[PDB]
Amino acid sequence: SWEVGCGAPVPLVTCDEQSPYRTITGDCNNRRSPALGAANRALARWLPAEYEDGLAVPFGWTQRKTRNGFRVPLAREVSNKIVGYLDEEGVLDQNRSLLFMQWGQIVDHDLDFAPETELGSSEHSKVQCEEYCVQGDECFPIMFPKNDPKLKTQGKCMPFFRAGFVCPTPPYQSLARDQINAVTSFLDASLVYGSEPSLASRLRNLSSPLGLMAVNQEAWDHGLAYPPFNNVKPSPCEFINTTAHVPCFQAGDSRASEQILLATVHTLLLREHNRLARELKRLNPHWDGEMLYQEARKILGAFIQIITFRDYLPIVLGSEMQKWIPPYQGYNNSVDPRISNVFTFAFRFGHMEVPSTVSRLDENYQPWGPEAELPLHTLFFNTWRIIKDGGIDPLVRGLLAKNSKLMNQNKMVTSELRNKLFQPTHKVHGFDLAAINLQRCRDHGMPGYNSWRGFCGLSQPKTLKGLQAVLKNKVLAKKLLDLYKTPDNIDIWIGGNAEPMVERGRVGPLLACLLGRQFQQIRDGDRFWWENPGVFTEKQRDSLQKVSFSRLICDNTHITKVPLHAFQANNYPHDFVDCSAVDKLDLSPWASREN
Ligand code: HEM
Ligand SMILES: *[C@@H]1O[C@H](CO)[C@@H](O[C@@H]2O[C@H](CO)[C@@H](O[C@H]3O[C@H](CO)[C@@H](O)[C@H](O)[C@@H]3O)[C@H](O)[C@H]2NC(C)=O)[C@H](O)[C@H]1NC(C)=O
Ligand SMILES: *[C@@H]1O[C@H](CO)[C@@H](O[C@@H]2O[C@H](CO)[C@@H](O[C@H]3O[C@H](CO)[C@@H](O)[C@H](O)[C@@H]3O)[C@H](O)[C@H]2NC(C)=O)[C@H](O)[C@H]1NC(C)=O
Ligand SMILES: *[C@@H]1O[C@H](CO)[C@@H](O[C@@H]2O[C@H](CO)[C@@H](O[C@H]3O[C@H](CO)[C@@H](O)[C@H](O)[C@@H]3O)[C@H](O)[C@H]2NC(C)=O)[C@H](O)[C@H]1NC(C)=O
Numbered sequence: 001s002w003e004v005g006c007g008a009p010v011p012l013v014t015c016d017e018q019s020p021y022r023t024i025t026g027d028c029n030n031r032r033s034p035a036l037g038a039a040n041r042a043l044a045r046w047l048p049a050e051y052e053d054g055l056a057v058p059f060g061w062t063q064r065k066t067r068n069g070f071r072v073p074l075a076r077e078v079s080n081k082i083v084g085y086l087d088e089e090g091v092l093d094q095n096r097s098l099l100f101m102q103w104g105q106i107v108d109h110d111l112d113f114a115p116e117t118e119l120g121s122s123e124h125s126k127v128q129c130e131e132y133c134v135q136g137d138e139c140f141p142i143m144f145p146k147n148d149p150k151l152k153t154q155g156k157c158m159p160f161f162r163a164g165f166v167c168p169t170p171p172y173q174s175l176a177r178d179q180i181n182a183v184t185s186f187l188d189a190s191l192v193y194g195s196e197p198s199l200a201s202r203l204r205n206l207s208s209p210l211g212l213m214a215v216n217q218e219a220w221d222h223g224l225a226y227p228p229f230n231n232v233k234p235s236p237c238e239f240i241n242t243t244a245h246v247p248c249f250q251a252g253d254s255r256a257s258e259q260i261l262l263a264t265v266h267t268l269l270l271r272e273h274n275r276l277a278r279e280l281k282r283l284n285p286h287w288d289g290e291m292l293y294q295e296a297r298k299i300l301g302a303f304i305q306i307i308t309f310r311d312y313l314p315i316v317l318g319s320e321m322q323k324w325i326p327p328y329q330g331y332n333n334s335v336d337p338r339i340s341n342v343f344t345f346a347f348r349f350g351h352m353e354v355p356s357t358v359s360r361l362d363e364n365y366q367p368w369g370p371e372a373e374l375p376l377h378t379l380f381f382n383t384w385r386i387i388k389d390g391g392i393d394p395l396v397r398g399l400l401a402k403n404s405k406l407m408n409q410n411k412m413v414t415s416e417l418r419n420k421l422f423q424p425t426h427k428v429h430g431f432d433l434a435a436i437n438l439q440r441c442r443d444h445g446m447p448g449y450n451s452w453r454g455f456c457g458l459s460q461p462k463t464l465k466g467l468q469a470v471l472k473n474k475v476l477a478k479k480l481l482d483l484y485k486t487p488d489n490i491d492i493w494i495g496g497n498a499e500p501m502v503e504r505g506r507v508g509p510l511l512a513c514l515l516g517r518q519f520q521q522i523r524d525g526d527r528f529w530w531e532n533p534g535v536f537t538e539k540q541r542d543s544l545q546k547v548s549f550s551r552l553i554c555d556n557t558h559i560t561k562v563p564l565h566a567f568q569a570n571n572y573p574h575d576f577v578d579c580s581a582v583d584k585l586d587l588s589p590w591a592s593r594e595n
């Protein structure tokens, strides 16, 4: 093999080994192999990478090269022919709220982030990619096909820059190219606290010994806090409304402001940490700031893990849940907790659950104002609608009363994301998330659809007839092969999401396997998993079984009417109760006595 000790992560950390707290970077979780699960390390490979030249060149780069004898289709063409649709009527999920979609994105951001490349503090190739669509080095443009409306209005391509990779940042050699995971693999609320020393310390309020996270000093939401502003210019959030001058928020994760509902949950989580810390100060007046911070933080990690494994995974995986994630039997230090490369594409099934609009509802859960329902595309990097247009309560009520979009073989990704995506570095609402997902699969060296069907012990369609039976759709199977020519060349993202959903779930057999085994691994490979004896005390876990997202809303917003089961579809007022009926977290178990 090639080097076994390569890398360029945070360099000088050593383990306490008896500390009851996670490190910020993820190091020291596994006592035998400390870097396992740590941030800024390579994404794991469950299968060898597939590149045009076997090392780093993505398939699709060289026009003359083939993949198993055929040309790989253009990402945008696949997007135009398979992924798009016009009519938004009838696409809503009748039994999943909008929060179902939104929590997925939260969990996802806690687990993985492969940042795009850079070496241009004052780059000009950065302009050669955008302006001229010239492929080279880290520019791997998404070219538009014959007859694409965007040709007439946008140019010849979308710019696209390859994902960052380990060891260096330089072109290189050595092993096959591995992309980086800039966040920690453990479900530990790294999206609230950060994955680097550097950022984690800047988010804290070190001006007072109260273990609080810094909040915004310029704006308030009915006496409730907002995240600090990221006062680095030029700002994407300012660009969308030159007049409002409202910057993006600063949170443990850089994508926090990608969309208004995401910014909203990040705010609730930040608020919850501070609520925590205050409650723990009343109970333990003698605790210093560091302990208030760590203890509140530890609690926040457990909430996220509990909501995720108890309420959210069961309804994604359905009947497949117990097949891949059996009851907890304790920590296993032999389990690899790393997020795999393929998981970062499998978890993108969520892109098909995003609806075309976002609503703001008032206290009676009725339209909030004259412009209550807004098109999704005007909410990318939009923080001014939150600070200057109602706060987060109207948005929170939308998350509860509105539905997620249902994955539909004939209607896969709304045009709000497929034609009007706004990328933070560029200036047009004209990008295509789907095409980007397809281009990224290739950038990341992903094996094809049948390689993963085999990995998961599932049949491999070799013929149109076989693909028809697997997809349970004659027309979809046909368009797919008219483009790919063999099921072996189908990009994992489109292939995985084209399969019919398993009973009581929201993903097909393949995705259920990839998702399922990954989640099983981060839970069983986590020394700080909340149920592992010694992490929390018995009385502390009894308190911790009573969480709910509904109650998180009650303690951190002025919404007083919430549903008992926030993830399923809920109708107002029938399924909405008063906050007094939802269980609270009893923190007396955290009361410490000195003598
Ligand atoms: C309107 C909501 C959303 C928007 C605007 C959005 C946008 C984006 C963008 C621009 C990327 C980067 C694509 C690339 O360069 O390869 C991305 C990646 C990703 N998305 Fe979404 N997304 C949304 C919702 C979701 C949902 C609901 C989920 C999961 C249920 C999800 C899962 C992911 C995952 C797992 C990644 C890969 C991150 C990484 O490992 O680097 N997203 N999203
Ligand atoms: C909308 O989705 C709901 C959740 O997916 C679904 O109800 C859930 O059904 C499961 C069984 O399929 C049950 O889960 C657990 O709940 C019972 C409580 O009586 C427990 O005793 C068992 O351990 C069981 O595993 C629940 O009854 C329920 N889950 C929750 C969290 O409420 C609805 O049926 C769906 N609605 C429609 C119209 O299909
Ligand atoms: C870090 O924590 C500090 C201590 O909790 C916090 O200070 C508090 O700041 C708020 C407002 O920023 C003050 O609230 C006061 O606001 C009005 C002013 O318009 C006063 O008239 C009221 O008395 C009200 O209490 C607190 O007084 C102040 N608390 C203390 C003990 O100084 C900082 O704001 C936090 N810093 C960051 C960056 O989040
Ligand atoms: C950019 O952000 C601006 C807000 O920071 C926003 O303008 C604001 O939105 C509307 C006008 O479009 C106004 O709302 C209503 O205000 C009072 C009610 O309190 C009414 O009397 C007005 O008629 C109006 O309907 C806000 O007052 C207005 N604020 C300002 C300073 O203009 C812009 O619409 C945003 N522009 C874009 C392109 O997004």
Ligand SMILES: *[C@@H]1O[C@H](CO)[C@@H](O[C@@H]2O[C@H](CO)[C@@H](O)[C@H](O)[C@H]2NC(C)=O)[C@H](O)[C@H]1NC(C)=O
Pocket (backbone or CB within 6 Å): 332, 333, 334, 335
């Ligand atoms: C911890 O997980 C490991 C790794 O999955 C288990 O160890 C072995 O794993 C291989 C690969 O699947 C299989 O042979 C068995 O699952 C295990 N081997 C044997 C001989 O048992 C192991 O089951 C787990 N360890 C504990 C203590 O639960």
Ligand SMILES: [Ca+2]
Pocket (backbone or CB within 6 Å): 110, 111, 183, 184, 185, 186, 187, 188, 189, 190, 191
């Ligand atoms: Ca994490």
